[PDB]
Structure formats: structure tokens, C-alpha cells
Ligand binder design. Structure first.
Ligand SMILES: O=C(Nc1cccnc1)NC1(Cc2ccccc2)CCOCC1
Ligand SMILES: O=C(Nc1cccnc1)NC1(Cc2ccccc2)CCOCC1
Lengths: 304, 304
């Protein structure tokens, strides 16, 4: 028993981290097979970040200008290309530590682990959710750009995020591994509006099921609700509308606990309307939305 | 910016995890050099766990009864010994992935990362604190025994915890790597009282400094206090008494923020007496005590 904000073991990803330097800018890159992936803003100067023409900036660069270092060994760059907001540096050596991997574009509300890196060296690992507004609330300092987010299914690492920037609001924006930003963000030092964020309703319900499995049951009540009634409450409290697809994904947890999804919705409704009255659930005094129904099943079943 | 409950990158530890089987019991072991360390309760049956005589149980076992598997390769056991509550299985092969390592006994209030494992395979990583009462609030299921806690200083892994059991209260107990339990616990299926736990005051103050560094400042007030006055409040709210040693360790954070430690104590005093009035600090609606002053400096400075 016990329920923690658990990240995937980061070993397979640590073996892919490298340092990429271009001019005076140093950030992190991801070395998979004979390609190193990194944010294209590695080619920017301080005057450039305000409004960069990446095409023109990249033209002034040659293969020998990209310094890629894996630990203490230097990699030889034999090609460079820009794909959306990522640079792909072809190297003459395939990473011997390349795990089985996929590049995936995750959906808002899904979770992943981040391996925060500086100068190509791993500093820490944490689990987070892609917010409904396509930002992530991470922990990143200057130099963390190029750190990646991922999920692991047995031996396969699905890379889903590469860190690009911190918005003036302190939240984080980045791309999939094809260099496409999540959300409306652009890789420019300009004020950028992150949309209105909402709470990931299906994740809060999944976490309420995790609480019941672990003995925290005080919030269970004698009530039920309907999807329509619950969604009137969700709208008022800036929660994502619950759909039948969300109910369907909660099926295994509803089956394990014997608590019908709409009954758990009625507990959530009362928690939204009345608050927690100074009580806690799984060591939290707020409703947690960073665990998906899959995370709850995985953590509660011990998937390795 | 941003502040997360960050674990150490687990790669160096993943390379040490093995599966240990004895009779019908399977748990995790830690393979360092030519020794595999695991909880001695791997030699227990179901009738034995209620009141085991480990000395007698181990006498009925031979080197060939301990099945140690690293991934898919079988290790050859050439010696076995019990040291306190851990079994040390000498193998004929030194682990090629053995990192630089130390065995350390951590103090209550200190933090560490846990790599939860099942059948010798890593499932996830999370950061936690050794509670003042020597329990840990982890996430462990049956089969997780032998999973370890550790800290990393550049290339050196300091192993500080090995998981042994879950108390009837759902909290976790284990040993240092010399097999000495943290706390009064014994490796027996019997009701065991964990002492009264307290909140780790120095960690809450460190986390309040992290909040200020990251822009969460609403809790800062126009007041100050004394160590004596603050400790009267800490006693009432079951917080650990703050000492000058704790003030001294908060020195760098006090210096970085320009907020005197006793002034931060006065903010904490008001938060204890008045609550958070429905507000949050670093995304939490309660006072967080799982970050040490060292963790806050490390996370805020990007130590890799
Ligand atoms: O976003 C970060 N820092 C960072 C800090 C903390 C967390 N995450 C990132 N760095 C900048 C990246 C950038 C953006 C667009 C074009 C060119 C470069 C933006 C700010 O100015 C310095 C470069
Ligand atoms: O503690 C765990 N399970 C577990 C589950 C979840 C989290 N952590 C551990 N397992 C037992 C270990 C034990 C203790 C003392 C002597 C002999 C063996 C105790 C309960 O009965 C089964 C063996």
C-alpha cells in the first residue's frame, strides 16, 4: 500500500543524454541511434532570442559548429537539419546505449516522467501531467533545455516531450520529438498566453479510486449523480467535462473497488462544493489530477 | 523556476537490481561488486513469518538454495551470511555495472529516492523522507522487499535504505545496508508500534524558502519570533523543535532570499495558527516537509 507521485526508472534515458553547444549556448540533446535531437534555439544569441529567423541563423552554421559531447567523449557531426523546432544532428556513431524507443505525441491530461538535465548530465526525475492548456508545471532552470519527458512500456521508451522554454508565468513549454510545440507556443522570447487551464477530471477520479484502494475512504458518500449533473459542477469549478470515454477508462478501477463511476463522481461533486474541511486524501489537502487511470492501475498492480 | 518532489536519476541503481528466490519466496536484491544484499526474510515460509528463528531457518539453507538472477542471467552463489536483518550472498561474478557507492545510515528527517522493484525489475522512482519516527510513507506492494533508498553525489551512490515490511498501519519499515532496522521494528509479522510522528520543521522552513525563490510569497508577514516562542508553537502543532543547528543549515537560503530564519519562523507560526485559508504554496494545500535545506539548494541551483 501507499500512493506516490512515481516517475519511471530513468536509466534508459540517462544513457541517451548528451551536451550540445553551438557558439556560446549549451543545452541538452537526446542521442538515439546516430541522431542527436535538441531544441533549435541552441543556435540563438541573446539579441536573436527576441525575434529569431531560425532558417537564416542555421545557414551560418556548419556541422563542425555543433559540439556534441556524451559524457567525456566528443561525437563527430556529419549532418544537420531542422525539423519544426528541433535540430537533428547526424553523428558518425550510433549510441550503444540506445534503448527500444518510439516518438509519441501525448494528449493533454496524460502523464510522463521528466529527466531534468544540465550540461548533458541528469540531475533528477519527476512525474508530471501535460496540462489541458499544453503547458507543464515542471522544475527547470537555465540550461535544462533539451531535457525530455517519456513513458516506458517494459523495454520501450516512448519519448513525448522535449523542454524548450519557460513562459513569463513560470510554467513550461516544449515540443514532441518531431519539434512540434504542444500548445500555441513559439520558440521566441515574447509574452505568450497559455490558455485557461482546467483540472483533469478523469485523473482526479482515478486518484479518488487510488485513495479508496489505500484505505482513505472518508469522502465516500451516500449519493450518486448523472454525467449531466456532474458536468454542471465540473463547469463551475473549471474541471474538464467527463465523457463516456473517461467513464470507460475508469472501468477497471470501478470494477476493482465496486464503486460505480457515477457514485465516485458524486463524492467528487461534494468535495468540490464543500471542500475537504481540513482533511487530507493520500497525504494531499487538494484534489490531485496528475495520475491517469493507467497510472493508478500500474502503481496498484506493480508493473515493472 | 518551478519546484517538484524530485528523485535522483535511478540508472546507477537499476544496474544493481537482481531477483533473489529462496524456496517459494521471491524478492529483490542489490548486487554490488561480488555481493548480493537482500532482506533475510527471503528464507521465511508463511508459518515462519509470525515468529521466525532466522538462525535456525538459515541453517537449513545452502548456497544452491539462493537463486539469484540479474535480468536473464543466473548468478552463482559461493557464500551466504546473515548480518543483522540482511542476507549477504557472495557470488562468483562482480557486477560490471557496480557504481561508486557507500553504505550510509541516514538521520530522521533526511530524504532519499526509492527505486521500487518487483522480481528484480525496476517499476518506478520517488523521493521521500525518513520520518522522525523512522518509518517511511512509501508505495510498496508484495514483492517490493529488497527495493532500496539512496542519494547520489555526482558519481557516488550512498545507499541508505532497504525495504523490509509494511506495518499494519500501511507505513513502511526497513534497514540500513548493514541490516539494522531504522526505528524499533523487527522483521516479524506482529503488531508493532511506530512512535508518535512529528513534522520536520527544518524541511518545512526550507520549502518556504523554495516557495519565496519561486514567487509564492503571500505567506510572508510583518512579524518575527524567537527560537523559544517558535518552539512553543512547534510543540503545540507536533513539529520538531528547531535548534541553532537547523537555523545554521538554513543559512544559505536565508542569505539567498534576504529573509532572516526567525522571520521565516514567524511566517510558519502564522501558517500553523491560521492555516492556509484555502490558498496554496508551491501547488500544495499543506505544509510540505519532504525537502531538506540541501534539496532546496540543489534543486534551485541545478546540481547534476
Ligand atoms: O527558456 C529559457 N530558460 C529556461 C529557464 C527555466 C526553465 N526553462 C527554461 N531560456 C530562453 C530560451 C529561448 C526561447 C526562445 C528563443 C530562444 C531561446 C528564453 C529566456 O531567455 C534565455 C533563453
Ligand atoms: O511486508 C510484507 N509485504 C509488503 C507489502 C507492501 C509493502 N511492503 C511490504 N510482507 C511480509 C514480510 C515479512 C515480515 C516479517 C517476517 C517475514 C516476512 C509481511 C506480511 O506477510 C507477508 C510477508
Amino acid at each position: 500500500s501507499g500512493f506516490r507521485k512515481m516517475a519511471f526508472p530513468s536509466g534508459k534515458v540517462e544513457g541517451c543524454m548528451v551536451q550540445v553547444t553551438c557558439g556560446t549556448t549549451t543545452l541538452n540533446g537526446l542521442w538515439l541511434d546516430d541522431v542527436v535531437y535538441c531544441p533549435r534555439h541552441v543556435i540563438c544569441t541573446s539579441e536573436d532570442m527576441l525575434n529569431p529567423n531560425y532558417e537564416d541563423l542555421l545557414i551560418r552554421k556548419s556541422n563542425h559548429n555543433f559540439l556534441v559531447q556524451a559524457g567525456n567523449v566528443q561525437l563527430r557531426v556529419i549532418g544537420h537539419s531542422m525539423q519544426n523546432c528541433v535540430l537533428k544532428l547526424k553523428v558518425d556513431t550510433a549510441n550503444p546505449k540506445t534503448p527500444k524507443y518510439k516518438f509519441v505525441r501525448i494528449q493533454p491530461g496524460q502523464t510522463f516522467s521528466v529527466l531534468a538535465c544540465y550540461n548533458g548530465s541528469p540531475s533528477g526525475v519527476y512525474q508530471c501531467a501535460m496540462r489541458p492548456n499544453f503547458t507543464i508545471k515542471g522544475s527547470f532552470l537555465n540550461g535544462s533545455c533539451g531535457s525530455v519527458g517519456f513513458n516506458i512500456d517494459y523495454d520501450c521508451v516512448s519519448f513525448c516531450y522535449m523542454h524548450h522554454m519557460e513562459l513569463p508565468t513560470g510554467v513550461h513549454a516544449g515540443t514532441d520529438l518531431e519539434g512540434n510545440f504542444y500548445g500555441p507556443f513559439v520558440d521566441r522570447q515574447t509574452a505568450q498566453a497559455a490558455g485557461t487551464d482546467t483540472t483533469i477530471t478523469v485523473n482526479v477520479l482515478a486518484w479518488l479510486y487510488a485513495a479508496v484502494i489505500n484505505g482513505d475512504r472518508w469522502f465516500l458518500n451516500r449519493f450518486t449523480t448523472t454525467l449531466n449533473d456532474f458536468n454542471l459542477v465540473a463547469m463551475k469549478y473549471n474541471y474538464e467535462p467527463l465523457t463516456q470515454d473517461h467513464v470507460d477508462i475508469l472501468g477497471p478501477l470501478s470494477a476493482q473497488t465496486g464503486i460505480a463511476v457515477l457514485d465516485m463522481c458524486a463524492s467528487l461533486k461534494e468535495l468540490l462544493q464543500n471542500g475537504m474541511n481540513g482533511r487530507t486524501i493520500l497525504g494531499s489537502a487538494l484534489l490531485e489530477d496528475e495520475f491517469t487511470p493507467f497510472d493508478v492501475v500500474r502503481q496498484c498492480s506493480g508493473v515493472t
